[PDB]
Design a protein around this ligand. Sequence first.
Ligand code: GDP
Ligand code: GDP
Ligand code: CA
Ligand code: CA
Lengths: 149, 149
Amino acid sequence: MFLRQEDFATVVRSTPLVSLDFIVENSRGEFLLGKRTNRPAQGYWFVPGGRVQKDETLEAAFERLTMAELGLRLPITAGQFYGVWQHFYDDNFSGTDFTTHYVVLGFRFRVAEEELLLPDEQHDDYRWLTPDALLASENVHANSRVYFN
Amino acid sequence: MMFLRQEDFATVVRSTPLVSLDFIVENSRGEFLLGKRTNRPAQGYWFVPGGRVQKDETLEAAFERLTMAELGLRLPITAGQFYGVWQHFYDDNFSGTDFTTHYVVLGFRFRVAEEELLLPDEQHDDYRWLTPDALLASENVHANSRVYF
Ligand SMILES: Nc1nc2c(ncn2[C@@H]2O[C@H](COP(=O)(O)OP(=O)(O)O)[C@@H](O)[C@H]2O)c(=O)[nH]1
Ligand SMILES: Nc1nc2c(ncn2[C@@H]2O[C@H](COP(=O)(O)OP(=O)(O)O)[C@@H](O)[C@H]2O)c(=O)[nH]1
Ligand SMILES: [Ca+2]
Ligand SMILES: [Ca+2]
């Protein structure tokens, strides 16, 4: 259920979003971050992830979101559950007039870089970063840095 | 902003998953608390106490608000044992049968002293402390509560 703009605005204004964030490792002990082109956390390096839709199972969401974010569909069985997190932003997808709140389910998994097809819709660049490098940069959003604390 | 007007809550339930905390509440003898629900969804079923997280509310704050509202006893989230992520889908909703309800649920288990609760009558018309074997044997205990045991 991909909502029309009016109803997505009302939803974001009124209730927490539920999302899956992906802690994606390569063959070198590095993790995938993309530089976000959408609000919230626009212009920051952030892990790939997205919200779960109405009446969508977590199993279905994991497949839809891995395909949408990484260009590679993976089943939820590939992910290692990595906690429940909470992300609060002062802005939203279409403005700076109300806040966004996510309750986030983290999942960690390792992939082969050559099997991904990284899309350009939500990020304008992608890097595989070591925990030390990502923790040392203010350009990586705090909500992504904490996964590596 | 937090407790929504009915109009806004209806839009939310129609359009996106709710995020809730369900409480697996044990007494000193190893029995667990179930209430007979007076509201939709799962109306008329025995169910664990629990409720949804509000916009811009931390999970820590929601746990305190919800234990107080559900049990008459405020407990901190540190008292709870994380008990998994679950998903509950219902064909009806708080206002009737016009649309479905979807919850992404964070389970928490903890023991209380029965004598210290002040069980409210707003959401349940009866309460029982049941053994796992007993609650598992009854179709009047909703499947979404039975699975915790
Ligand atoms: N109109 C609309 N936009 C959405 C919906 N869900 C997500 N979006 C937007 O679609 C894009 C991708 O969604 P998602 O990956 O879930 O969002 P993220 O938290 O920004 O990474 C972002 O620009 C979101 O703001 C929806 O139901 N309706
Ligand atoms: N108007 C309104 N009602 C709500 C809201 N959140 C929950 N409710 C209703 O308030 C009561 C208690 O909420 P909760 O414990 O979260 O619901 P449960 O899932 O039915 O146990 C139920 O009747 C819900 O339908 C809200 O933001 N606005
Ligand atoms: Ca995304
Ligand atoms: Ca409740």
